[PDB]
Amino acid sequence: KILTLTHNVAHYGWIPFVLYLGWAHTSNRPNFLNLLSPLPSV
Amino acid sequence: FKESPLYTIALNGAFFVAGVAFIQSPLMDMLAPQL
Amino acid sequence: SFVRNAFTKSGNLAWTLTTTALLLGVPLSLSILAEQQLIEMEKTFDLQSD
């Protein structure tokens, strides 16, 4: 089901590409829990 | 006695031009606080 | 009679105008008061620095 496999990528995979974009350019590069956490606990 | 769409458009335009005169007048500047 | 009609008209217009004026002004009152409070404390800080 490659056709719908590409379909699921558009929804779930768009934001993490942006997230991966920022995390790549972050000088800190924390872990996924810290990225998704709205807390400033760093 | 008209009570027409022309009446309501005329009153809207009169209100607009009155507001324009008010905003141009230095009375608004007086309303504007010095600070 | 006409007196009661005029009284009701005056009361209604007074109520609506008062409500609009207060809800326009109280936020202005508090905001300008806070800003001028900041201004005066900043002036006092300048004076104590100098």
């Binding site: 974009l21 350019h25 | 809207n12 608004m28 | 800003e35």
Partner: protein
């Protein structure tokens, strides 16, 4: 070509920014809401503009229960992604080939409705700016266009006045011939930039005339009027009181409704906000309050935010 340069004109803003002051900057229609609203936006870096936002809201039909968004903006490229509960993916990309020529596309997944997307190619010259936008094109089997097209031109005839026009062609299906929408633009600028006027005539018979002013460095106001046989018109006066600590906006309407919105910053990161509109032709009110946390992503920006 030489005397054209000798005229010494300037580049006007875009049509979307034609009414920027009176519509967006001064008034509150863009910013107003109803009910409780909580916002959690935070930036991990500044020079590469990158931040993510959390939005909690209840009581307003337009705003969802919870939505999450993120955005990035480098020197020439801007990106923004947004997600909502029910998984309505929203994303927009803005890339600039040059400081004058910018390509940008908007995306919005509905997940239950046909997804709509708009693409905009924006170019500006020394004296005019051109935009072309479309909404869900489609090519018929004959090679003929089917969709909605948006394109406008705007040129400053004199350094204080500019005139513009927009062309809108919408081909819904191709069975019915497409219709055309032509609108006229008029913008005037004070020599001292004290006051700005803007007036437009839409293809739908709707005329929007707006006047803006800058009373001083901290005080400004504006007036606008709209209109639409069946003809209906409205007028709204308002003023924005900007300050270093709090921001006020007020509004009076010809339709007998009043509104006020107040952004009050209490901390460098805490920003409480209030808004409420009150109608009188039917004696009802709408009230909304909220706040915004803004936090840094790293210790350096965390220290910088406090100073």
């Amino acid at each position: 070509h030489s005397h054209r340069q000798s005229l010494e004109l300037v580049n006007p803003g875009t049509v979307e920014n034609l009414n920027k002051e009176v519509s967006r900057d001064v008034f509150l229609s863009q910013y107003f809401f109803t009910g409780l609203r909580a916002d959690l936006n935070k930036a991990f870096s500044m020079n590469p503009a990158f931040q993510t936002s959390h939005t909690f809201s209840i009581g307003s039909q337009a705003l969802p229960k919870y939505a999450f968004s993120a955005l990035f903006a480098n020197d020439n490229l801007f990106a923004q992604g947004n997600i909502d509960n029910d998984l309505s993916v929203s994303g927009r990309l803005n890339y600039g080939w040059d400081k004058k020529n910018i390509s940008k596309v908007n995306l919005q997944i509905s997940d239950g409705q046909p997804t709509m997307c708009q693409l905009e190619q924006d170019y500006q010259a020394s004296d005019f700016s051109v935009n072309v936008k479309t909404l869900n094109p489609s090519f018929s089997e004959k090679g003929e266009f089917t969709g909605v097209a948006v394109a406008s031109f705007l040129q400053s005839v004199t350094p204080q006045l500019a005139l513009g026009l927009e062309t809108l062609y919408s081909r819904t299906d191709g069975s019915a011939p497409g219709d055309a929408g032509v609108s006229y633009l008029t913008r005037y600028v004070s020599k001292k930039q004290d006051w700005i006027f803007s007036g437009q005539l839409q293809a739908n018979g709707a005329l929007i005339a707006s006047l803006w002013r800058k009373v001083a460095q901290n005080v400004e106001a504006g007036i606008e009027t709209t209109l639409q046989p069946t003809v209906e018109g409205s007028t709204t006066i308002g003023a924005k009181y900007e300050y270093r600590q709090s921001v006020y906006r007020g509004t009076l309407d010809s339709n007998g409704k009043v509104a006020c919105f107040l952004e009050r910053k209490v901390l460098p990161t805490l920003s409480v906000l209030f808004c409420g509109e009150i109608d009188h032709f039917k004696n009802d009110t709408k009230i909304g309050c909220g706040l915004q946390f803004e936090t840094a992503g790293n210790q350096e920006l965390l220290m910088l935010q406090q100073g």
